[PDB]
Amino acid sequence: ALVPMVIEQTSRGERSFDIYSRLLKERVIFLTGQVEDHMANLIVAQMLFLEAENPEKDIYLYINSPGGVITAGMSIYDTMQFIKPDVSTICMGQAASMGAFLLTAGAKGKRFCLPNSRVMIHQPLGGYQGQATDIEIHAREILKVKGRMNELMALHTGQSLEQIERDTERDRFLSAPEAVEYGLVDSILTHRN
Amino acid sequence: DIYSRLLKERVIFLTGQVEDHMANLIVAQMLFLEAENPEKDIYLYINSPGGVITAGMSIYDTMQFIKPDVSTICMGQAASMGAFLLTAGAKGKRFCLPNSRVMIHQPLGGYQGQATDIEIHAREILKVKGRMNELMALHTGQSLEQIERDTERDRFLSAPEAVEYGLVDSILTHRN
Amino acid sequence: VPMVDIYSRLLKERVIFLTGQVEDHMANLIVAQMLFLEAENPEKDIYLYINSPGGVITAGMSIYDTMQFIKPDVSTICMGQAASMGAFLLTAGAKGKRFCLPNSRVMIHQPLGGYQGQATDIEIHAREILKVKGRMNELMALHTGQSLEQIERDTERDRFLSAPEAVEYGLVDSILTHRN
Amino acid sequence: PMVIEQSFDIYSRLLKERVIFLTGQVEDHMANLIVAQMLFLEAENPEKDIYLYINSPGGVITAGMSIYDTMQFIKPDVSTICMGQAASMGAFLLTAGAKGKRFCLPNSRVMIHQPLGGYQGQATDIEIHAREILKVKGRMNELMALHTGQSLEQIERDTERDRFLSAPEAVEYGLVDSILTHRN
Amino acid sequence: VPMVERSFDIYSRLLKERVIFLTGQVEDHMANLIVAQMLFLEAENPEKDIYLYINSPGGVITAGMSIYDTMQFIKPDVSTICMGQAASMGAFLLTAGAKGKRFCLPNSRVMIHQPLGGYQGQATDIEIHAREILKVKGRMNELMALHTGQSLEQIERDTERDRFLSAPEAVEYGLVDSILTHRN
Amino acid sequence: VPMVFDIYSRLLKERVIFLTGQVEDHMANLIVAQMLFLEAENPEKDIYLYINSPGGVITAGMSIYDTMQFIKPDVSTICMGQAASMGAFLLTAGAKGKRFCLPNSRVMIHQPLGGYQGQATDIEIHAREILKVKGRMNELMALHTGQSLEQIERDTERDRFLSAPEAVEYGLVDSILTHRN
Amino acid sequence: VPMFDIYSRLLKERVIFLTGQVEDHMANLIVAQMLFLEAENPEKDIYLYINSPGGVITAGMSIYDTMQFIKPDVSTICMGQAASMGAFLLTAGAKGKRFCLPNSRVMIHQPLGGYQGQATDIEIHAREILKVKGRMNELMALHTGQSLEQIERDTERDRFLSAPEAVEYGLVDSILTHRN
Amino acid sequence: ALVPMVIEERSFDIYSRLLKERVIFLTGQVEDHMANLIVAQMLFLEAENPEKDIYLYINSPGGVITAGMSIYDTMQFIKPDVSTICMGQAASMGAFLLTAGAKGKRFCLPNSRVMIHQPLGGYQGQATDIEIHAREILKVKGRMNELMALHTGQSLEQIERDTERDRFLSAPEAVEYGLVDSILTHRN
Amino acid sequence: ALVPMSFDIYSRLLKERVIFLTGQVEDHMANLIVAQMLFLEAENPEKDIYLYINSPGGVITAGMSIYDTMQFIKPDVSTICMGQAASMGAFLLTAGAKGKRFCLPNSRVMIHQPLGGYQGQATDIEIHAREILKVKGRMNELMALHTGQSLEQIERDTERDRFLSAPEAVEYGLVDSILTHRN
Ligand SMILES: CC(C)(C(=O)NCCSc1ccccc1Cl)S(=O)(=O)c1ccc(C(F)(F)F)cn1
Ligand SMILES: CC(C)(C(=O)NCCSc1ccccc1Cl)S(=O)(=O)c1ccc(C(F)(F)F)cn1
Ligand SMILES: CC(C)(C(=O)NCCSc1ccccc1Cl)S(=O)(=O)c1ccc(C(F)(F)F)cn1
Ligand SMILES: CC(C)(C(=O)NCCSc1ccccc1Cl)S(=O)(=O)c1ccc(C(F)(F)F)cn1
Ligand SMILES: CC(C)(C(=O)NCCSc1ccccc1Cl)S(=O)(=O)c1ccc(C(F)(F)F)cn1
Ligand SMILES: CC(C)(C(=O)NCCSc1ccccc1Cl)S(=O)(=O)c1ccc(C(F)(F)F)cn1
Ligand SMILES: CC(C)(C(=O)NCCSc1ccccc1Cl)S(=O)(=O)c1ccc(C(F)(F)F)cn1
Ligand SMILES: CC(C)(C(=O)NCCSc1ccccc1Cl)S(=O)(=O)c1ccc(C(F)(F)F)cn1
Ligand SMILES: CC(C)(C(=O)NCCSc1ccccc1Cl)S(=O)(=O)c1ccc(C(F)(F)F)cn1
Fold first, then answer.
1. Are B81 and B48 in contact (CB under 8 A)?
2. The domain at F1-181 falls in which architecture?
3. What CATH number should be reported for the domain whose range is B1-176?
4. I87 in active site
5. DSSP D59
6. Domain A1-193: CATH architecture, name and number where available
7. What DSSP line would sit under F50-108, residue for residue?
8. Helix H65-77 vs helix H32-48: crossing angle, to nearest 10
9. Yes or no: domain I1-183 corresponds to CATH 3.90.1300.10
10. Sequence-distant contacts of E1-5: CB under 8 A, at least 24 apart
11. How far is the CA of G157 from the centre of ligand 8 (A)?
């Protein structure tokens, strides 16, 4: 039924798990599609759940996303940094905009691209409508957000802030090897050994 | 052609929303009247809720450029760009009808796109805001700082209040 | 229609029609017609037929101030109905020269409006429509001869008046039945 | 929504730890859900803290006030944690948390402003509804002043137009008590 | 949505403690559900109070009256609690609660007004339907007078247009008995 | 439109043409026909093109541009309100010494925008084409303004707004018209 | 519509405009203008300005055959763009009298179409558009001087040409820059 | 439209049942969420038993390339072989994922059809940004052609020539092309 | 779910190896049919499967996913037309195991050629028209095989919609007989 169930055994008896809750028992979380508040809250809740079950074991965050809303992405980002476990990140398909941000935000040494995934980074997009006074207020805010985002990308990639600023004024696409070279991820996963 | 008839008496009507084509129609009429006689006054009746600033400025500059004085007359209302054009009329020849109202405020706008472009378009509408306030101060006799304070939010003025503010010169009540 | 135009024809006799909803452009058409007529002859009366459910106050006030400004008297004739701004412009006609047809009706009420936005701006716009309301009530008290308080009480909700009741109220001067 | 049958999602899973999420637009039904969770948790244990995560652009004031008054009424402390953003009613409910237990995540943002509204109708009714939203605005300003430590006059000035705050600025403003960066 | 061997949604959990939520617009089906919950609760214990939380902008009068007559018919007291807002029919049902057991949360608001309606058709039918809504208005005013202690004439005057009341004003008017602030 | 001859036709006999609103094929064709007609009435006398436009379609704008250059009379341009994108391009394309801004008009310049949908092969074809158009427009812009090609390129990667005085300094127009002399 | 309009005036100068999408009714206007001009003077050139993205082929062929049938030469002038059928009609002008303005562009490609229905009917309509394609390629070859095989290769996908390239391709004979 | 259940008490939908037998269905257009579901099933199966084959039935008109590549790389990464079976059709990304199956274990049903072609895309915006997005989709086109060459045994040059326009193949033509290894007709 | 204990009436009949194909044929309902056949085959590769068909037809490739599954699996698939079997529905009806294809007495069958549609460059139009003509040929060949009619007869009869009563469908070779009352 759309999402398949699996049957796992006792403890107290047979119990049904949808395929995602099943993978969750293996410390795996999926980030898929556009980033927005509710899908982001779901991810946050999963991260919290997993930290609790075991604050010492790694969490694996698969990312396939075109990007999305920045504040929603930051609820995930700050959770990744806050919880005790390392969050290993794995890009499959693509990680663009906020998707790329969260990918590179993973634990150092534990950020990966699948061989044919692609990454894209760029500056924030936005929009307001209203009085000039309010326009200035909202324009200043998004410039502050852009700057803050550039700083964090600088931190996680190892690139200079100026390098990040220059490279993200317009859409920049990277292959998996180019992403390793850029510092967005640490290596490429090709085969289970 | 009741309007064409009145155009022959150097009367032009600015009615409704200010936008490029109705503004162009006003500009063409002003150019025509100037030509037919550069010495005689032109009368611009204004009844408008406002509209697009660049379209309004095409009228503003035409009003200043041509040789004849442009007398402005507010009937009903002159709001936003409508109030601007009302107050832009020739000194001593700007009028309100007794029950017209005037409203002044700052520019509204909107953009969508990359942050870099958002800054560019924000800087531009802020510059336009600044320029409009300077022109408003110039024509009303109010200080720039006074205009800035009074146009942050919508400000309504009755006809007598508009005379005192310097937006118009007097009220027309009955023909002489 | 009817392409000889029937209105252009009637305009030559200083007859103007205000028909349907009051808004800026039809109001501007009326103002233009009054100006033309004043010029054509500043001493002869103008006849304004009114059949209207009302409309935008500022557009209506462009007609009102024009009526008061020009030198000729504007005789007003209510046909069908004169409601809201229609009733206002009817009673605004030259004293002694305001008429209802026998089966026309008049309706008076307070202004309607609406805003959306910040509370500060809501307060600004509410304050404005209240000023307009007060001003409209003063002008109606003035033209009907009613006290301001009577106008205020009667326009809080829709008030319908027959042609005889409109004469009695002071909205018009008399009823026209048959041409003399 | 991460489902184990016995319909039991990740949120039900987190509720077992007295953690509640306020996410997205504030309105009557999502708020009723929040109130119900707080009532359930209080009973399960009236002495242990409740944790309310907030990620919201704001929403309807009367709905927000259902959550506010419930937060104050129940016996447990409600610790509030801003993630992503807390704007308008979201910021209001955030600062409404138990003193000392209101937090911002490092890269969350807070925004405060005055109420928005709208009416359509007769001038008399317009006036009734305008005075009502002005009364609501005053009440909100008083409560904000109370919870932040700012003066009423300061809140009034600062909320005439949208005001954005970083997490450090929100601490400095008194909206929250501290920034959470890493699990203890 | 939140769940808590056995499984049960949180509203079901609260229902077992005689708490019913009335949230949003009053209409036939949501009203049916409330009536049904009241009956269930009476059976479970005809002596213990029932608590009806109200957060509503109002709604359909006949729907509301199905709740009203049910509140009056059953044996248990129905204590009413306003959270967020109780407007129009929401306010009526709030004040219809058991005397001494009607409450406002400190920052909830109440609004009262007359019925709204509309018909279209022949003048003869227009008269029939106009006469009917006038009868409903009269009855609603009588019952409002009954529960508030206000005179019929005062209710009539006070409800010709929307009237908003703060929680203290609602106690003063007699719509509710007191304010709930803090648990014991 | 008032009669006196419609107001625009009346102005046309005085060699005045209005370019108003978005540039597209049919309004552009109207401009072109007016220019051909005027060239006719007198191949020696100046033509006046008032411009108030947010821009529009490039190929439509180029029909006006090439007509301006082809015909015998000088086409003097006057910006009122605004001249943006293609509107700015046509403004600066006027006869040298006869390009004007009204004092409170504004000018905006940027690169072309476009869009295609289809197979990668065709995307490549259409992408290369708009890139050629971009280069041609920058060369022509450099030509009429006096700016270097490299300068035009850098300044038009994003929207660049100019006041009437700034447009004069940039070389987009020759001077400001303030009062009829 | 600056007025007798500006187009009627230019028509008196044997100038016809083909502007926008090619379809039956605008095409019929062009054919009618050409017939009229042939009449007024069967020996003098007709000037056809073209600014078009293309359009319906049969509609374009009504113009094409009219151009060839009438006695006067039809000179074609591309301003802005001549794409698809627009480019076809440009190149179809009288030998030696086909022009591009300097910054006009030309685009050529194969026909587009679409059908839906039974497989049998799909086959009928596919066969037809393929015949139209072949016929258009032959005609393009004829007017450009290119070989049939060169046209076929160059029009499988959109091919853009600058004004100098269009002269070199044989689509037009020269570039007009300034009037003689 | 409901999914059939079975009682045995306990219950499960037939798809969950087939999943326990290591059968996964890829059906309809390829897009992120259905692709994620396929990825998750593959992960789950690798788990239950990293040595046993996984069977992916494919009936798809194609879809989003990046979504398809999330499946492609998962197929390549996991330890078990992924056998692919085309029923109905495998077009565009569907044909790509079909040919990406474990060598020797890629099948067409007798009346399935396969279609291969180059990527489609579209952008709107400034010329500078148009160039960036055109450059990117051309890189993608190139990468897909290389991978197609790899799995089919065709030369990169042959793949390039054959995919400029839609190319349809019958099941025997798909075997001859190297898209699949054989045709499944009847069960053993 | 409609009639459950969710365990609906269809799940109950599935336990008796009865599958329903109802309404328009498209990928997802087809996949559901395929999944049920696979499930039934595994539970018992020797017992017949019963496929009830009431369908106006639908997408050919979706239908062929069902067809090839029917032929691949070990059990015989008996087909029963109720109401109607039109286009792809008639095809799957006649695709059942020979001797085990039935019409109910007042069901009707309709056969015809493929329908389709494309839009684009002439070159691409040719590619897609050639493809639907190949599909048409293959479907005519398969219809001839299962009905016993000559290729020429199928072709002549399917250029336009051809309606058949249940007796006419038996006589045509589309089904083997009519089911009227249960044994
Ligand atoms: C909000 C908290 C309580 C939280 O998320 N708790 C639940 C973790 S999920 C979980 C826990 C145990 C067992 C099972 C699960 Cl799923 S917290 O650990 O992020 C937290 C938040 C705030 C504070 C403090 F600020 F009060 F110190 C301390 N801890
Ligand atoms: C653009 C001009 C020619 C203009 O508006 N001309 C027509 C005025 S309308 C008219 C004129 C004569 C007779 C009848 C009419 Cl309707 S101008 O007079 O505003 C003008 C514009 C520019 C320059 C100059 F910059 F070249 F000096 C000189 N004059
Ligand atoms: C704006 C004026 C000039 C006006 O309406 N003029 C045209 C009247 S219509 C007309 C006049 C003459 C012949 C034919 C017609 Cl239709 S006015 O008479 O209302 C007027 C308006 C303002 C002033 C003054 F303020 F300058 F004194 C003087 N007169
Ligand atoms: C309405 C009440 C009864 C309430 O929320 N009850 C249910 C609490 S949820 C719960 C309780 C016990 C066990 C488990 C759960 Cl989930 S109350 O505690 O808010 C309340 C409301 C009103 C009054 C009084 F006014 F009658 F005194 C007393 N108590
Ligand atoms: C119709 C009756 C039999 C009724 O509601 N019966 C079922 C009550 S719910 C119940 C009873 C026993 C055990 C369990 C439950 Cl849930 S009643 O006549 O007792 C009755 C009950 C209630 C009302 C009213 F409150 F709606 F007016 C009117 N009549
Ligand atoms: C196309 C032509 C004839 C044109 O526009 N003619 C009409 C000009 S409008 C006119 C002219 C005189 C009097 C009145 C009017 Cl409206 S042209 O003069 O631009 C032209 C175009 C092309 C060639 C040539 F290539 F054949 F040399 C020669 N002349
Ligand atoms: C259809 C015809 C009559 C036609 O277009 N006639 C009108 C030309 S427009 C014209 C001609 C002269 C004067 C004024 C005008 Cl507008 S024709 O000349 O193209 C024509 C068409 C067909 C035949 C014939 F086949 F019968 F011989 C002879 N002539
Ligand atoms: C992210 C991992 C842990 C993963 O997909 N786990 C879920 C496997 S599903 C599963 C496995 C066992 C039992 C049950 C299930 Cl559902 S992984 O095997 O793809 C993996 C990913 C990354 C790394 C490393 F980079 F850290 F080395 C090592 N392993
Ligand atoms: C894909 C396969 C394995 C399949 O359909 N498997 C699941 C059958 S359903 C089932 C099976 C066992 C128990 C319960 C159920 Cl429901 S197959 O039988 O169609 C198949 C497909 C391919 C090959 C081979 F090519 F590798 F030989 C062999 N078998």
1. yes
2. Alpha-Beta Complex (3.90)
3. 3.90.226.10
4. yes
5. B
6. Alpha-Beta Complex (3.90)
7. EEEE--B-HHHHHHHHHHHHHSSS-EEEEEEEEEETHHHHHHHTSPTT-EEE-TT-EEE
8. 10
9. no
10. E1/D9, E1/D11, E1/D33, E2/D11, E2/D12, E2/D15, E2/D33, E2/D36, E2/D37, E2/D40, E3/D7, E3/D8, E3/D9, E3/D12, E4/D12, E4/D15, E4/D40, E5/A12, E5/D6
11. 47
Residues of C in contact with D157 (CB under 8 A): none
> Cβ of I129 and G111 within 8 Å?
no
Cα H125 to Cα B7, E99, F111, F112, F166: the distances in Å are 45, 67, 10, 8, 27
Nearest to G106 by CA among G132, G130, G85, G134: G85
CATH architecture of H1-188: Alpha-Beta Complex (3.90)
Q: Do A125 and B113 touch (CB under 8 A)?
A: yes
Question: Atom 16 in ligand 6: which residue has the minimum CA distance?
Answer: F37
- The token pair at A181 is 């070279």
CA–centroid distance, I19 to ligand 9, in Å, is 19
Which of 2.40.50.140, 1.10.10.10, 3.40.50.1820, 3.90.226.10 would CATH assign to domain G1-180?
3.90.226.10
| Experimental technique for the deposited model | X-ray
What the block records as the tokens of B145 is 């700082």
SS3 state at F162: strand
Query: Of all residues in chain F, what percent are helix, strand and coil, respectively (each to 5)?
Result: 45, 25, 30
Architecture of domain E1-184: Alpha-Beta Complex (3.90)
Which one from A65, A97, A156, A167 is the annotated catalytic residue? A97
- H/E stretch holding D36: helix D28-44
What subunits touch chain G, counting only 3 or more CB pairs under 8 A?
A: F, I
How far is Cα B93 from Cα B169, in angstroms, rounded to an integer?
Answer: 7
- What is d(CA D50, CA D17) in angstroms, rounded to the nearest whole number? 8
Chain F residues whose CB is inside 8 A of the G15 CB are 36
How far is CA A55 from its chain centroid? 20
Name every chain D residue with its beta carbon within 8 A of the beta carbon of A41. 21, 23, 53, 55
List phi, psi (to 5°) of H146: -60, -45
The question of whether F110 is a catalytic residue gets the answer yes
User: Which residues of H are identified as catalytic?
Assistant: 92, 117, 166
Strands E178-179 and A28-32, bridge-based pairing: unpaired
- The experimental resolution of this structure, in angstroms, equals 1.9
Identified catalytic residue from E49, E66, E77, E113: E113
Residue B43, ligand 3, Cβ within 6 A? yes
CB D23 within 8 A of CB A38: yes
